[PDB]
Amino acid sequence: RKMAFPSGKVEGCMVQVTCGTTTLNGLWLDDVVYCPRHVICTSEDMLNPNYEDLLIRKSNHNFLVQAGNVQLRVIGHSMQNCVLKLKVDTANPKTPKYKFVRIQPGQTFSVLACYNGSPSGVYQCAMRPNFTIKGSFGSCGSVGFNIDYDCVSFCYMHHMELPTGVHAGTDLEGNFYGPFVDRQTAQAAGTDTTITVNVLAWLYAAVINGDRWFLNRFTTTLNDFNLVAMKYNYEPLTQDHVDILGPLSAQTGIAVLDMCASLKELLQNGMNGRTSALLEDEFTPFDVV
Amino acid sequence: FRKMAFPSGKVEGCMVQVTCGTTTLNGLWLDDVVYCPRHVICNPNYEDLLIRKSNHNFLVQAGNVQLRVIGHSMQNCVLKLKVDTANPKTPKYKFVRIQPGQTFSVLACYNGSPSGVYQCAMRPNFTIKGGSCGSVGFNIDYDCVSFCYMHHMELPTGVHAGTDLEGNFYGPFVDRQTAQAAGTDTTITVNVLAWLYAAVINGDRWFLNRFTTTLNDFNLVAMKYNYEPLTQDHVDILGPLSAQTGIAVLDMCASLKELLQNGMTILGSALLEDEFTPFDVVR
Description:
Two copies of one chain form a homodimer. Chain A is an alpha+beta fold. Among the domains of chain A are: 9-88, Thrombin, subunit H, CATH 2.40.10.10; 196-289, main proteinase (3clpro) structure, domain 3. Helices cover 22% and strands 28% of the residues of chain A. The first copy, chain A, has eight helices and 13 strands. Chain A has helices at 8-11, 51-56, 196-208, 222-230, 239-244, 246-252, 256-269, 285-288; strands at residues 14-19, 22-29, 32-36, 63-67, 70-72, 74-80, 83-88, 97-100, 108-115, 118-126, 143-148, 151-161, 167-170. In chain A, helix 3 runs parallel beside helix 6 (246-252), helix 3 crosses helix 7 and helix 4 (222-230) packs parallel to helix 7. The radius of gyration of chain A is 22 Å and the shape is elongated. At the A-B interface, helix 1 and strand 10 of A face helix 1 and strand 10 of B. Chain A: Residues 1-289 are cytoplasmic. Chain A: 3CL-PRO exists as monomer and homodimer. Only the homodimer shows catalytic activity. Interacts with host FBXO22; this interaction promotes the proteasomal degradation of nsp5. Chain A: The active site is at residues 38, 140.
Protein backbone atom coordinates (compact mmCIF):
# COMPACT_ATOMS: atom_id res chain seq x y z
CA ARG A 1 0.00 0.00 0.00
CA LYS A 2 0.98 3.59 -0.61
CA MET A 3 0.98 4.73 3.01
CA ALA A 4 0.89 8.30 4.24
CA PHE A 5 2.74 9.50 7.31
CA PRO A 6 0.68 9.79 10.49
CA SER A 7 -0.64 13.35 10.23
CA GLY A 8 -1.15 14.34 13.88
CA LYS A 9 2.04 16.40 14.20
CA VAL A 10 0.90 18.51 11.20
CA GLU A 11 -2.80 18.67 12.22
CA GLY A 12 -1.76 20.62 15.33
CA CYS A 13 -0.18 23.31 13.13
CA MET A 14 -3.07 24.00 10.74
CA VAL A 15 -4.85 27.36 11.01
CA GLN A 16 -7.20 29.50 8.95
CA VAL A 17 -6.00 32.78 7.44
CA THR A 18 -8.49 35.36 6.21
CA CYS A 19 -7.65 38.63 4.48
CA GLY A 20 -10.67 40.48 3.15
CA THR A 21 -12.98 37.97 1.50
CA THR A 22 -10.17 35.47 0.85
CA THR A 23 -9.71 32.58 3.31
CA LEU A 24 -7.21 29.70 3.06
CA ASN A 25 -4.97 27.50 5.18
CA GLY A 26 -1.90 28.56 7.11
CA LEU A 27 0.86 26.64 8.87
CA TRP A 28 1.52 27.75 12.47
CA LEU A 29 5.05 26.90 13.63
CA ASP A 30 6.49 28.58 16.75
CA ASP A 31 5.30 32.22 16.46
CA VAL A 32 4.95 32.40 12.64
CA VAL A 33 2.03 31.49 10.38
CA TYR A 34 3.05 30.58 6.80
CA CYS A 35 0.49 30.87 4.01
CA PRO A 36 0.29 31.59 0.25
CA ARG A 37 0.78 35.30 -0.39
CA HIS A 38 -2.18 35.30 -2.77
CA VAL A 39 -4.43 35.41 0.32
CA ILE A 40 -4.09 39.19 -0.18
CA CYS A 41 -5.48 39.02 -3.76
CA THR A 42 -9.11 39.52 -4.74
CA SER A 43 -9.51 37.25 -7.79
CA GLU A 44 -9.38 40.22 -10.16
CA ASP A 45 -5.94 40.88 -8.65
CA MET A 46 -4.87 37.39 -9.70
CA LEU A 47 -4.58 38.34 -13.39
CA ASN A 48 -1.72 40.79 -12.78
CA PRO A 49 -1.00 40.92 -9.05
CA ASN A 50 1.59 43.41 -7.85
CA TYR A 51 2.32 41.74 -4.52
CA GLU A 52 4.65 44.47 -3.22
CA ASP A 53 1.95 47.09 -3.82
CA LEU A 54 -0.83 44.91 -2.42
CA LEU A 55 1.12 44.06 0.74
CA ILE A 56 2.35 47.56 1.65
CA ARG A 57 -1.32 48.62 1.95
CA LYS A 58 -2.05 45.97 4.64
CA SER A 59 -1.67 46.26 8.39
CA ASN A 60 -1.38 43.47 10.94
CA HIS A 61 -5.07 43.70 11.80
CA ASN A 62 -6.15 43.04 8.19
CA PHE A 63 -5.07 39.39 8.76
CA LEU A 64 -7.53 37.23 10.73
CA VAL A 65 -5.82 34.04 11.91
CA GLN A 66 -7.96 31.41 13.66
CA ALA A 67 -6.54 28.30 15.33
CA GLY A 68 -9.70 26.32 15.93
CA ASN A 69 -11.75 28.53 18.24
CA VAL A 70 -8.95 30.94 19.20
CA GLN A 71 -8.13 34.05 17.21
CA LEU A 72 -4.38 34.66 17.02
CA ARG A 73 -3.09 38.24 17.15
CA VAL A 74 -0.90 39.10 14.16
CA ILE A 75 1.91 41.44 15.25
CA GLY A 76 4.01 41.57 12.08
CA HIS A 77 4.13 40.38 8.52
CA SER A 78 6.62 39.87 5.73
CA MET A 79 6.77 38.19 2.34
CA GLN A 80 9.46 35.66 1.40
CA ASN A 81 9.18 34.85 -2.29
CA CYS A 82 5.59 33.58 -2.68
CA VAL A 83 4.77 32.83 0.97
CA LEU A 84 3.46 35.30 3.53
CA LYS A 85 4.93 35.02 7.03
CA LEU A 86 2.57 36.33 9.72
CA LYS A 87 4.25 36.92 13.07
CA VAL A 88 1.76 36.15 15.85
CA ASP A 89 2.04 36.89 19.57
CA THR A 90 1.69 33.23 20.66
CA ALA A 91 4.08 30.41 19.83
CA ASN A 92 2.23 27.27 18.79
CA PRO A 93 2.40 24.97 21.85
CA LYS A 94 1.93 21.98 19.50
CA THR A 95 4.91 22.84 17.27
CA PRO A 96 6.68 19.56 16.42
CA LYS A 97 10.35 19.21 15.72
CA TYR A 98 10.56 20.36 12.12
CA LYS A 99 12.70 21.55 9.26
CA PHE A 100 12.07 23.01 5.80
CA VAL A 101 13.43 21.03 2.83
CA ARG A 102 13.19 21.46 -0.91
CA ILE A 103 12.56 18.22 -2.76
CA GLN A 104 13.28 17.07 -6.31
CA PRO A 105 10.97 15.44 -8.88
CA GLY A 106 10.43 11.76 -8.07
CA GLN A 107 10.48 12.33 -4.31
CA THR A 108 7.41 11.35 -2.28
CA PHE A 109 5.62 12.99 0.64
CA SER A 110 2.28 13.12 2.42
CA VAL A 111 -0.23 15.93 1.99
CA LEU A 112 -2.69 16.91 4.70
CA ALA A 113 -5.56 18.38 2.69
CA CYS A 114 -7.39 21.04 4.73
CA TYR A 115 -10.35 23.36 4.23
CA ASN A 116 -10.55 26.66 6.14
CA GLY A 117 -7.97 25.47 8.66
CA SER A 118 -9.49 22.07 9.41
CA PRO A 119 -7.78 18.83 8.33
CA SER A 120 -9.92 16.84 5.92
CA GLY A 121 -7.73 13.96 4.72
CA VAL A 122 -4.19 12.75 4.22
CA TYR A 123 -2.69 11.16 1.14
CA GLN A 124 0.71 10.07 -0.13
CA CYS A 125 2.19 11.95 -3.10
CA ALA A 126 5.05 12.16 -5.52
CA MET A 127 6.41 15.34 -7.07
CA ARG A 128 5.89 14.61 -10.78
CA PRO A 129 8.74 15.20 -13.25
CA ASN A 130 6.77 18.18 -14.63
CA PHE A 131 6.80 19.67 -11.07
CA THR A 132 3.10 19.19 -10.42
CA ILE A 133 1.12 17.14 -7.94
CA LYS A 134 -1.73 14.86 -8.97
CA GLY A 135 -3.70 15.61 -5.82
CA SER A 136 -7.20 16.22 -4.48
CA PHE A 137 -7.32 19.93 -3.69
CA GLY A 138 -10.26 25.80 -1.11
CA SER A 139 -7.27 23.72 -0.02
CA CYS A 140 -4.66 26.41 -0.77
CA GLY A 141 -2.04 26.48 1.97
CA SER A 142 -2.27 22.74 2.75
CA VAL A 143 1.26 21.38 3.13
CA GLY A 144 3.26 18.31 2.15
CA PHE A 145 5.71 16.67 4.51
CA ASN A 146 7.79 13.66 5.48
CA ILE A 147 8.41 12.56 9.06
CA ASP A 148 11.81 11.13 10.10
CA TYR A 149 12.26 10.19 13.77
CA ASP A 150 9.63 12.59 15.11
CA CYS A 151 10.98 15.41 12.94
CA VAL A 152 8.62 16.81 10.32
CA SER A 153 10.25 17.91 7.06
CA PHE A 154 7.89 20.36 5.35
CA CYS A 155 8.51 20.33 1.61
CA TYR A 156 5.40 21.61 -0.19
CA MET A 157 2.68 24.22 0.20
CA HIS A 158 -0.28 24.26 -2.18
CA HIS A 159 -0.89 27.48 -4.15
CA MET A 160 -2.51 26.90 -7.57
CA GLU A 161 -4.75 24.57 -9.55
CA LEU A 162 -3.66 24.15 -13.16
CA PRO A 163 -6.25 23.69 -15.92
CA THR A 164 -5.37 19.99 -16.32
CA GLY A 165 -6.67 19.41 -12.78
CA VAL A 166 -3.21 19.11 -11.20
CA HIS A 167 -1.61 21.26 -8.52
CA ALA A 168 1.37 23.59 -8.25
CA GLY A 169 2.99 25.05 -5.17
CA THR A 170 6.13 26.12 -3.39
CA ASP A 171 8.60 25.00 -0.83
CA LEU A 172 8.27 26.62 2.59
CA GLU A 173 10.64 29.41 1.60
CA GLY A 174 8.03 30.36 -1.01
CA ASN A 175 9.96 29.20 -4.12
CA PHE A 176 7.71 27.52 -6.69
CA TYR A 177 8.40 24.04 -7.92
CA GLY A 178 8.68 24.21 -11.71
CA PRO A 179 8.02 27.21 -13.96
CA PHE A 180 4.77 28.19 -12.29
CA VAL A 181 3.74 31.53 -10.77
CA ASP A 182 1.00 32.66 -8.37
CA ARG A 183 -0.82 34.55 -11.09
CA GLN A 184 -3.77 33.40 -13.19
CA THR A 185 -1.90 33.00 -16.50
CA ALA A 186 -2.04 30.52 -19.34
CA GLN A 187 0.45 28.25 -17.65
CA ALA A 188 0.06 24.51 -18.07
CA ALA A 189 1.91 21.45 -16.87
CA GLY A 190 4.20 20.04 -19.52
CA THR A 191 3.77 16.45 -20.62
CA ASP A 192 4.30 14.25 -17.61
CA THR A 193 6.73 11.34 -17.62
CA THR A 194 7.03 8.18 -15.56
CA ILE A 195 9.54 8.14 -12.68
CA THR A 196 11.69 5.30 -14.00
CA VAL A 197 13.96 4.94 -10.98
CA ASN A 198 10.83 4.56 -8.84
CA VAL A 199 9.38 1.82 -11.08
CA LEU A 200 12.68 -0.08 -10.84
CA ALA A 201 12.81 0.25 -7.03
CA TRP A 202 9.26 -1.11 -6.92
CA LEU A 203 10.20 -4.04 -9.18
CA TYR A 204 13.00 -4.76 -6.71
CA ALA A 205 10.37 -4.67 -3.97
CA ALA A 206 8.32 -7.20 -5.96
CA VAL A 207 11.30 -9.56 -6.15
CA ILE A 208 11.88 -9.06 -2.41
CA ASN A 209 8.25 -9.95 -1.73
CA GLY A 210 8.87 -13.17 -3.72
CA ASP A 211 7.44 -12.29 -7.14
CA ARG A 212 9.59 -12.75 -10.21
CA TRP A 213 7.39 -13.78 -13.13
CA PHE A 214 8.49 -10.61 -14.98
CA LEU A 215 12.22 -11.29 -14.95
CA ASN A 216 13.90 -12.49 -18.16
CA ARG A 217 17.34 -13.69 -19.29
CA PHE A 218 18.31 -10.44 -21.05
CA THR A 219 20.39 -7.46 -20.05
CA THR A 220 20.73 -4.02 -21.59
CA THR A 221 23.17 -1.20 -21.89
CA LEU A 222 22.12 1.94 -20.06
CA ASN A 223 21.83 3.84 -23.32
CA ASP A 224 19.73 1.17 -25.06
CA PHE A 225 17.42 1.10 -22.04
CA ASN A 226 16.98 4.88 -22.21
CA LEU A 227 16.39 4.84 -25.98
CA VAL A 228 13.55 2.35 -25.48
CA ALA A 229 12.13 3.75 -22.24
CA MET A 230 11.88 7.27 -23.65
CA LYS A 231 9.53 5.94 -26.34
CA TYR A 232 7.11 5.11 -23.48
CA ASN A 233 7.46 8.62 -21.92
CA TYR A 234 9.69 7.27 -19.16
CA GLU A 235 12.24 9.56 -17.57
CA PRO A 236 15.86 8.91 -18.56
CA LEU A 237 17.74 6.74 -16.07
CA THR A 238 21.02 8.26 -14.89
CA GLN A 239 24.18 6.77 -13.43
CA ASP A 240 23.05 8.38 -10.16
CA HIS A 241 19.82 6.39 -10.39
CA VAL A 242 21.78 3.20 -11.13
CA ASP A 243 23.90 3.95 -8.07
CA ILE A 244 20.81 4.63 -5.92
CA LEU A 245 19.36 1.20 -6.73
CA GLY A 246 22.66 -0.50 -5.82
CA PRO A 247 21.54 -1.71 -2.37
CA LEU A 248 18.32 -3.23 -3.73
CA SER A 249 20.32 -4.87 -6.53
CA ALA A 250 22.49 -6.51 -3.87
CA GLN A 251 19.62 -7.62 -1.63
CA THR A 252 17.90 -9.44 -4.51
CA GLY A 253 20.91 -10.58 -6.56
CA ILE A 254 19.47 -8.89 -9.69
CA ALA A 255 21.76 -6.44 -11.47
CA VAL A 256 20.33 -2.99 -12.19
CA LEU A 257 20.61 -3.28 -15.97
CA ASP A 258 19.08 -6.75 -15.69
CA MET A 259 16.05 -5.22 -13.97
CA CYS A 260 16.11 -2.58 -16.70
CA ALA A 261 15.84 -5.42 -19.24
CA SER A 262 12.77 -6.72 -17.40
CA LEU A 263 11.20 -3.24 -17.41
CA LYS A 264 11.79 -2.94 -21.17
CA GLU A 265 9.95 -6.24 -21.63
CA LEU A 266 7.12 -5.21 -19.29
CA LEU A 267 6.56 -2.04 -21.35
CA GLN A 268 6.55 -4.12 -24.53
CA ASN A 269 4.22 -6.85 -23.21
CA GLY A 270 2.12 -5.40 -20.42
CA MET A 271 1.01 -7.63 -17.57
CA ASN A 272 -0.97 -10.28 -19.44
CA GLY A 273 -3.69 -10.09 -16.79
CA ARG A 274 -1.33 -10.31 -13.84
CA THR A 275 -0.26 -7.89 -11.11
CA SER A 276 -1.42 -3.69 -9.25
CA ALA A 277 -2.15 -3.90 -13.01
CA LEU A 278 -0.06 -0.76 -13.53
CA LEU A 279 3.63 0.00 -13.29
CA GLU A 280 3.77 2.02 -10.06
CA ASP A 281 6.13 5.01 -9.87
CA GLU A 282 5.37 6.77 -6.56
CA PHE A 283 7.55 4.62 -4.28
CA THR A 284 11.14 5.75 -4.01
CA PRO A 285 14.20 3.51 -3.54
CA PHE A 286 14.32 4.94 -0.01
CA ASP A 287 10.62 4.10 0.43
CA VAL A 288 11.12 0.53 -0.82
CA VAL A 289 13.75 -0.25 1.81
CA PHE B 1 -8.97 10.97 -8.01
CA ARG B 2 -6.94 10.30 -4.87
CA LYS B 3 -7.78 7.78 -2.20
CA MET B 4 -7.70 9.75 1.05
CA ALA B 5 -7.25 8.53 4.64
CA PHE B 6 -8.72 10.37 7.61
CA PRO B 7 -6.30 12.54 9.60
CA SER B 8 -4.90 10.17 12.18
CA GLY B 9 -3.93 12.48 15.04
CA LYS B 10 -6.89 11.59 17.26
CA VAL B 11 -5.95 7.90 17.02
CA GLU B 12 -2.17 8.40 17.25
CA GLY B 13 -2.69 9.68 20.79
CA CYS B 14 -4.30 6.34 21.77
CA MET B 15 -1.70 3.83 20.59
CA VAL B 16 0.32 1.93 23.18
CA GLN B 17 2.52 -1.16 23.42
CA VAL B 18 1.23 -4.29 25.19
CA THR B 19 3.65 -7.04 26.24
CA CYS B 20 2.71 -10.39 27.72
CA GLY B 21 5.78 -12.56 28.21
CA THR B 22 7.67 -12.69 24.93
CA THR B 23 4.74 -11.38 22.84
CA THR B 24 4.40 -7.66 22.07
CA LEU B 25 1.75 -5.99 19.91
CA ASN B 26 -0.31 -2.80 19.68
CA GLY B 27 -3.04 -1.69 22.05
CA LEU B 28 -5.71 1.02 22.01
CA TRP B 29 -5.85 3.21 25.14
CA LEU B 30 -9.24 4.87 25.69
CA ASP B 31 -9.90 6.44 29.11
CA ASP B 32 -8.57 3.86 31.61
CA VAL B 33 -8.85 0.74 29.41
CA VAL B 34 -6.37 -0.69 26.91
CA TYR B 35 -7.85 -2.89 24.16
CA CYS B 36 -5.73 -5.42 22.25
CA PRO B 37 -6.02 -8.86 20.60
CA ARG B 38 -6.58 -11.57 23.20
CA HIS B 39 -3.91 -13.73 21.53
CA VAL B 40 -1.28 -11.55 23.22
CA ILE B 41 -1.57 -14.05 26.11
CA CYS B 42 -0.46 -16.84 23.76
CA ASN B 43 -5.43 -24.89 19.96
CA PRO B 44 -5.85 -22.36 22.78
CA ASN B 45 -8.17 -22.25 25.76
CA TYR B 46 -8.40 -18.50 26.27
CA GLU B 47 -10.73 -18.78 29.28
CA ASP B 48 -8.08 -20.90 31.01
CA LEU B 49 -4.98 -19.07 29.76
CA LEU B 50 -6.40 -15.79 31.14
CA ILE B 51 -7.41 -17.22 34.54
CA ARG B 52 -3.74 -18.21 34.96
CA LYS B 53 -2.60 -14.65 34.16
CA SER B 54 -2.46 -11.81 36.70
CA ASN B 55 -2.11 -8.05 36.24
CA HIS B 56 1.66 -8.41 36.73
CA ASN B 57 1.85 -10.49 33.51
CA PHE B 58 0.96 -7.44 31.38
CA LEU B 59 3.37 -4.60 30.62
CA VAL B 60 1.74 -1.57 28.98
CA GLN B 61 3.90 1.28 27.66
CA ALA B 62 2.61 4.65 26.44
CA GLY B 63 5.72 6.04 24.80
CA ASN B 64 8.07 6.38 27.76
CA VAL B 65 5.45 5.82 30.49
CA GLN B 66 4.65 2.37 31.82
CA LEU B 67 0.96 2.09 32.67
CA ARG B 68 0.11 -0.21 35.58
CA VAL B 69 -2.51 -2.84 34.78
CA ILE B 70 -5.07 -3.11 37.60
CA GLY B 71 -7.70 -5.35 36.01
CA HIS B 72 -8.02 -7.67 33.05
CA SER B 73 -10.99 -9.12 31.24
CA MET B 74 -11.92 -10.54 27.86
CA GLN B 75 -14.71 -9.48 25.52
CA ASN B 76 -14.92 -12.01 22.68
CA CYS B 77 -11.49 -11.90 20.97
CA VAL B 78 -10.43 -8.57 22.55
CA LEU B 79 -8.44 -8.32 25.78
CA LYS B 80 -9.43 -5.40 28.06
CA LEU B 81 -6.71 -4.20 30.44
CA LYS B 82 -7.85 -1.68 33.02
CA VAL B 83 -4.99 0.69 33.81
CA ASP B 84 -4.25 3.17 36.59
CA THR B 85 -4.21 6.22 34.30
CA ALA B 86 -6.94 7.55 32.02
CA ASN B 87 -5.67 8.64 28.60
CA PRO B 88 -5.84 12.48 28.65
CA LYS B 89 -5.81 12.35 24.82
CA THR B 90 -8.93 10.17 24.54
CA PRO B 91 -11.06 11.47 21.63
CA LYS B 92 -14.80 11.41 21.41
CA TYR B 93 -15.32 7.90 20.05
CA LYS B 94 -17.70 5.03 19.37
CA PHE B 95 -17.22 1.33 18.67
CA VAL B 96 -19.01 0.39 15.43
CA ARG B 97 -19.19 -2.65 13.17
CA ILE B 98 -19.01 -2.03 9.43
CA GLN B 99 -20.28 -4.01 6.41
CA PRO B 100 -18.31 -5.60 3.55
CA GLY B 101 -17.55 -2.96 0.96
CA GLN B 102 -17.41 -0.14 3.48
CA THR B 103 -14.16 1.81 3.79
CA PHE B 104 -12.05 3.02 6.70
CA SER B 105 -8.56 4.27 7.53
CA VAL B 106 -5.97 2.05 9.23
CA LEU B 107 -3.20 3.48 11.40
CA ALA B 108 -0.43 0.91 10.95
CA CYS B 109 1.65 0.72 14.13
CA TYR B 110 4.80 -1.11 15.22
CA ASN B 111 5.26 -1.76 18.96
CA GLY B 112 2.90 1.06 19.88
CA SER B 113 4.47 3.58 17.45
CA PRO B 114 2.31 4.88 14.56
CA SER B 115 4.03 4.14 11.25
CA GLY B 116 1.60 5.11 8.48
CA VAL B 117 -2.04 5.58 7.62
CA TYR B 118 -3.93 4.20 4.64
CA GLN B 119 -7.47 3.89 3.29
CA CYS B 120 -9.00 0.38 3.18
CA ALA B 121 -12.12 -1.35 2.16
CA MET B 122 -13.52 -4.36 3.95
CA ARG B 123 -13.60 -6.91 1.13
CA PRO B 124 -16.77 -8.96 0.45
CA ASN B 125 -14.86 -11.97 1.77
CA PHE B 126 -14.28 -10.05 5.02
CA THR B 127 -10.51 -9.61 4.63
CA ILE B 128 -8.40 -6.49 4.21
CA LYS B 129 -5.70 -6.03 1.59
CA GLY B 130 -3.12 -4.02 3.56
CA GLY B 131 4.24 -6.61 14.36
CA SER B 132 1.12 -4.69 13.30
CA CYS B 133 -1.34 -6.75 15.40
CA GLY B 134 -3.59 -4.49 17.41
CA SER B 135 -3.53 -1.65 14.84
CA VAL B 136 -7.00 -0.23 14.37
CA GLY B 137 -9.23 0.96 11.55
CA PHE B 138 -11.55 3.93 11.92
CA ASN B 139 -13.73 6.60 10.37
CA ILE B 140 -14.09 10.13 11.71
CA ASP B 141 -17.40 12.00 11.65
CA TYR B 142 -16.85 15.62 12.81
CA ASP B 143 -14.79 15.22 16.04
CA CYS B 144 -16.06 11.60 16.73
CA VAL B 145 -13.79 8.61 15.95
CA SER B 146 -15.74 5.47 15.04
CA PHE B 147 -13.40 2.54 15.62
CA CYS B 148 -14.42 -0.33 13.36
CA TYR B 149 -11.47 -2.74 13.06
CA MET B 150 -8.60 -4.21 15.04
CA HIS B 151 -5.92 -6.23 13.31
CA HIS B 152 -5.46 -9.83 14.49
CA MET B 153 -3.78 -11.97 11.82
CA GLU B 154 -2.29 -12.39 8.35
CA LEU B 155 -3.85 -15.03 6.10
CA PRO B 156 -1.59 -17.07 3.78
CA THR B 157 -2.64 -15.17 0.65
CA GLY B 158 -1.12 -12.08 2.32
CA VAL B 159 -4.40 -10.36 3.32
CA HIS B 160 -5.47 -9.38 6.84
CA ALA B 161 -8.21 -10.51 9.20
CA GLY B 162 -9.43 -8.93 12.39
CA THR B 163 -12.30 -8.03 14.66
CA ASP B 164 -14.48 -5.12 15.55
CA LEU B 165 -13.57 -3.38 18.80
CA GLU B 166 -16.00 -5.61 20.73
CA GLY B 167 -13.92 -8.65 19.66
CA ASN B 168 -16.26 -10.03 16.99
CA PHE B 169 -14.40 -11.35 13.97
CA TYR B 170 -15.01 -10.14 10.48
CA GLY B 171 -15.16 -13.25 8.35
CA PRO B 172 -15.08 -16.98 9.14
CA PHE B 173 -11.71 -16.73 10.87
CA VAL B 174 -10.52 -17.72 14.37
CA ASP B 175 -7.57 -16.52 16.48
CA ARG B 176 -5.71 -19.86 16.23
CA GLN B 177 -2.70 -21.07 14.27
CA THR B 178 -4.91 -23.52 12.34
CA ALA B 179 -5.22 -23.63 8.54
CA GLN B 180 -7.44 -20.83 7.24
CA ALA B 181 -7.96 -19.20 3.87
CA ALA B 182 -9.80 -16.24 2.43
CA GLY B 183 -12.86 -17.12 0.40
CA THR B 184 -12.94 -16.25 -3.29
CA ASP B 185 -13.16 -12.50 -3.36
CA THR B 186 -15.58 -10.40 -5.38
CA THR B 187 -15.56 -6.85 -6.76
CA ILE B 188 -17.70 -4.36 -4.79
CA THR B 189 -20.16 -3.33 -7.51
CA VAL B 190 -21.82 -0.40 -5.72
CA ASN B 191 -18.39 1.15 -5.15
CA VAL B 192 -17.42 0.73 -8.81
CA LEU B 193 -20.59 2.59 -9.78
CA ALA B 194 -19.88 5.35 -7.24
CA TRP B 195 -16.41 5.67 -8.76
CA LEU B 196 -17.97 5.96 -12.22
CA TYR B 197 -20.16 8.79 -10.90
CA ALA B 198 -16.96 10.43 -9.63
CA ALA B 199 -15.42 10.19 -13.11
CA VAL B 200 -18.48 11.88 -14.63
CA ILE B 201 -18.38 14.61 -11.97
CA ASN B 202 -14.70 15.02 -12.96
CA GLY B 203 -15.52 15.51 -16.66
CA ASP B 204 -14.79 11.92 -17.73
CA ARG B 205 -17.83 10.97 -19.81
CA TRP B 206 -16.78 8.70 -22.70
CA PHE B 207 -18.14 5.48 -21.16
CA LEU B 208 -21.66 6.87 -20.89
CA ASN B 209 -24.02 5.42 -23.49
CA ARG B 210 -27.63 5.88 -24.59
CA PHE B 211 -28.78 2.57 -23.05
CA THR B 212 -30.33 1.37 -19.79
CA THR B 213 -30.38 -2.15 -18.32
CA THR B 214 -32.50 -4.10 -15.85
CA LEU B 215 -31.47 -4.78 -12.28
CA ASN B 216 -31.83 -8.48 -13.06
CA ASP B 217 -30.06 -8.52 -16.44
CA PHE B 218 -27.15 -6.63 -14.89
CA ASN B 219 -26.96 -9.08 -11.99
CA LEU B 220 -26.67 -12.01 -14.39
CA VAL B 221 -23.89 -10.03 -16.10
CA ALA B 222 -22.29 -9.19 -12.74
CA MET B 223 -22.40 -12.78 -11.44
CA LYS B 224 -20.38 -13.93 -14.48
CA TYR B 225 -17.60 -11.36 -14.04
CA ASN B 226 -17.18 -11.99 -10.27
CA TYR B 227 -18.97 -8.81 -9.16
CA GLU B 228 -21.17 -8.53 -6.08
CA PRO B 229 -24.86 -8.49 -6.97
CA LEU B 230 -26.52 -5.06 -6.96
CA THR B 231 -29.54 -4.56 -4.70
CA GLN B 232 -32.31 -2.00 -4.62
CA ASP B 233 -30.66 -0.51 -1.52
CA HIS B 234 -27.51 -0.09 -3.62
CA VAL B 235 -29.52 1.85 -6.22
CA ASP B 236 -31.07 3.98 -3.46
CA ILE B 237 -27.65 4.79 -1.96
CA LEU B 238 -26.49 5.92 -5.43
CA GLY B 239 -29.56 8.17 -5.83
CA PRO B 240 -27.77 11.38 -4.79
CA LEU B 241 -25.19 10.78 -7.52
CA SER B 242 -27.91 9.94 -10.06
CA ALA B 243 -29.68 13.20 -9.21
CA GLN B 244 -26.46 15.24 -9.30
CA THR B 245 -25.21 13.89 -12.65
CA GLY B 246 -28.45 13.05 -14.45
CA ILE B 247 -27.28 9.46 -15.00
CA ALA B 248 -29.76 6.96 -13.59
CA VAL B 249 -28.22 3.97 -11.85
CA LEU B 250 -29.39 1.41 -14.40
CA ASP B 251 -28.02 3.85 -16.99
CA MET B 252 -24.62 3.69 -15.28
CA CYS B 253 -25.06 -0.09 -14.95
CA ALA B 254 -25.38 -0.26 -18.73
CA SER B 255 -22.06 1.61 -18.92
CA LEU B 256 -20.48 -0.83 -16.46
CA LYS B 257 -21.75 -3.94 -18.27
CA GLU B 258 -20.39 -2.47 -21.52
CA LEU B 259 -17.01 -1.81 -19.86
CA LEU B 260 -16.88 -5.30 -18.33
CA GLN B 261 -17.28 -6.87 -21.79
CA ASN B 262 -15.40 -4.58 -24.20
CA GLY B 263 -12.77 -2.91 -21.99
CA MET B 264 -11.62 0.69 -22.20
CA THR B 265 -8.75 6.03 -19.44
CA ILE B 266 -11.26 6.55 -16.57
CA LEU B 267 -9.89 8.89 -13.87
CA GLY B 268 -6.42 8.00 -15.13
CA SER B 269 -6.98 4.34 -14.26
CA ALA B 270 -7.14 1.13 -16.28
CA LEU B 271 -8.94 -1.20 -13.89
CA LEU B 272 -12.22 -0.29 -12.22
CA GLU B 273 -11.60 0.96 -8.68
CA ASP B 274 -13.93 -0.49 -6.05
CA GLU B 275 -12.62 0.96 -2.74
CA PHE B 276 -14.55 4.25 -2.86
CA THR B 277 -18.03 4.12 -1.36
CA PRO B 278 -20.87 6.37 -2.54
CA PHE B 279 -20.37 8.36 0.68
CA ASP B 280 -16.64 8.74 -0.07
CA VAL B 281 -17.42 10.16 -3.52
CA VAL B 282 -19.93 12.71 -2.24
CA ARG B 283 -17.35 13.72 0.39
